[PDB]
Amino acid sequence: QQPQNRMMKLAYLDRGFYKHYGIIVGDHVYQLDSDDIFKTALTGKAKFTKTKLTSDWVIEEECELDYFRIKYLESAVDSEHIFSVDKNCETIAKDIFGTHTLSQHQAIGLVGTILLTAGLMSTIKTPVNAVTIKEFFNHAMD
Amino acid sequence: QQPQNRMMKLAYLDRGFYKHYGIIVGDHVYQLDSDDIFKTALTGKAKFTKTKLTSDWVIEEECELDYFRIKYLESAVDSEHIFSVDKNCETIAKDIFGTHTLSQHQAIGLVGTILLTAGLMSTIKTPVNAVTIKEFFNHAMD
Numbered sequence: 001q002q003p004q005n006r007m008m009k010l011a012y013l014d015r016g017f018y019k020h021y022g023i024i025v026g027d028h029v030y031q032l033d034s035d036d037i038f039k040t041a042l043t044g045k046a047k048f049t050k051t052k053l054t055s056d057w058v059i060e061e062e063c064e065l066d067y068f069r070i071k072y073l074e075s076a077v078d079s080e081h082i083f084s085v086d087k088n089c090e091t092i093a094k095d096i097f098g099t100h101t102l103s104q105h106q107a108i109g110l111v112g113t114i115l116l117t118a119g120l121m122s123t124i125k126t127p128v129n130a131v132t133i134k135e136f137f138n139h140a141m142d
Numbered sequence: 143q144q145p146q147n148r149m150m151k152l153a154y155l156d157r158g159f160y161k162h163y164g165i166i167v168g169d170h171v172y173q174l175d176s177d178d179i180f181k182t183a184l185t186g187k188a189k190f191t192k193t194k195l196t197s198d199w200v201i202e203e204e205c206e207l208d209y210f211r212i213k214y215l216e217s218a219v220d221s222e223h224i225f226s227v228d229k230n231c232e233t234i235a236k237d238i239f240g241t242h243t244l245s246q247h248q249a250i251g252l253v254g255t256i257l258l259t260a261g262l263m264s265t266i267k268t269p270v271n272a273v274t275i276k277e278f279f280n281h282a283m284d
């Protein structure tokens with residue numbers, strides 16, 4: 001097995017329409033607290049939480065973080081993003097990255113982008129017609 | 143044929159990965175000014191523009207607005223949202239809805255929700271792995 005810097009154990013809860021992604025660290029999972037992926041997309045806001053690891057979580061795969069760290073610090077130069085944290089994420093940066101190289105704001109920007117993007121990637125392509133737009137619009141309002 | 147109040151003529155530009163939705167009024171189309179739908183979702187910002195109707199736009203379906211008007215009114219009354227307008231949208235509210243009943247803000251909130259939701263609905267489900275999350279992460283940093 002080759003040398004690796006800090007990895008991310010990417011996992012998901014299967015919500016049928018989409019997969020809700022998280023990063024496993026030890027016995028906990030960092031994740032966006034969203035119930036609905038299109039809700040996050042429409043509101044422009046996403047908050048991290050931390051929950052207990054359970055057997056409902058499925059490992060998607062163990063990925064290198066190196067690429068993302070280099071790419072992130074290249075591009076996101078003290079920029080704003082849509083992510084924040086709840087009360088349970090005091091050690092999120094150190095926990096995920098194993099270092100204080102990244103600030104909390106950077107850590108959650110990078111990881112938030114990963115989790116929301118993965119969620120979005122996993123969404124089932126749905127026909128758009130008068131019926132389905134009503135269905136999803138109705139869901140967006142509730 | 144049947145009594146209708148103001149209808150929406152929904153249309154799209156087919157962008158392969160997603161369909162980019164618009165509302166046609168006469169010879170113009172109101173649409174989100176974005177060429178990357180996951181980027182819109184990640185940034186929490188979407189801005190309307192108006193372009194000239196072209197033969198590239200595919201008519202999806204003519205849908206009733208009534209349901210959406212009543213639902214929006216009763217649900218997200220004066221809630222802030224992610225939508226704004228560019229210089230070309232001065233008459234967007236009147237053009238789309240026929241009357242001054244909705245403020246510019248309620249109108250773009252309603253129509254925005256519809257267009258972004260439809261756009262997201264249409265996105266091709268993509269496997270999530272080290273390769274693809276890098277690809278989509280990479281796009282999200284541009």
Ligand code: NA
Pocket residue numbers: 120121122123124125262263264265266267
């Ligand atoms: Na999709």
